[PDB]
């Protein structure tokens with residue numbers, strides 16, 4: 391049943407975990423895309439859900455970053471997955487969070503809350519991002535410090551990696567914030583873009599449609615709020631068939 395085997399699991403909190411799985415031979419994707427994964431219910435019927443692939447396209451192993459919803463049909467079960475066990479993975483990638491769906495530009499922004507960092511876990515490790523852009527800005531906002539941990543460790547490890555670390559050097563700017571716990575930088579993405587705080591903090595020019603391209607991943611509310619701010623700076627939604635300055639993915 392499109393089965394793949396789990397090779398690693400890390401629990402970040404009781405409501406957040408990541409895992410790696412073997413890669414289907416026929417899967418060809420672009421960093422930022424998503425696929426469907428799942429498990430069988432009591433009656434043998436698949437419980438299938440859209441998931442961003444959190445590993446870059448070049449990686450022979452796949453990574454996922456998952457919520458656990460206590461009464462959620464999939465994740466109430468998926469949270470208990472172990473190394474050596476199998477998941478269903480349909481190798482049909484889709485999604486608009488891909489570099490091909492943006493006009494060429496100079497700065498690339500990843501704007502994520504919660505598990506929305508997942509496609510950017512992929513793209514931050516994608517050579518094409520650093521080939522096609524001079525700066526890559528990762529804004530990740532969560533309520534609590536523990537919710538940032540998967541991403542903070544990902545960025546530490548990629549910065550230390552002799553291959554990826556070299557590609558991202560002087561290009562990747564990582565801007566994690568919390569909104570409900572004290573942390574070195576705080577505040578919503580919407581608010582820190584609108585006030586210009588992120589520009590002040592990183593010491594970079596304000597957002598403009600000539601140079602900036604952006605990708606958004608998170609809840610419906612998050613996307614709605616962030617889109618309004620992007621539009622306030624003159625950036626337009628495109629995806630493809632007609633690429634423009636930003637793309638969004640809402641769940």
Ligand SMILES: Cc1cc2nc3c(=O)[nH]c(=O)nc-3n(C[C@H](O)[C@H](O)[C@H](O)COP(=O)(O)OP(=O)(O)OC[C@H]3O[C@@H](n4cnc5c(N)ncnc54)[C@H](O)[C@@H]3O)c2cc1C
Nearest residue numbers: 439440441442455456457459462463464465466505508641
């Ligand atoms: C394009 C796309 C990409 C996705 N990528 C991811 C991903 O990388 N990681 C991930 O954990 N989920 C992701 N999701 C959500 C995922 O498809 C499922 O909803 C999730 O696995 C929960 O499944 P469930 O059956 O346990 O609960 P569901 O019945 O699917 O959802 C129950 C409730 O929990 C909320 N909820 C579900 N998922 C999340 C979440 N991730 N964060 C906050 N609230 C949530 C829902 O809004 C809903 O109210 C993605 C969804 C879309 C459409």
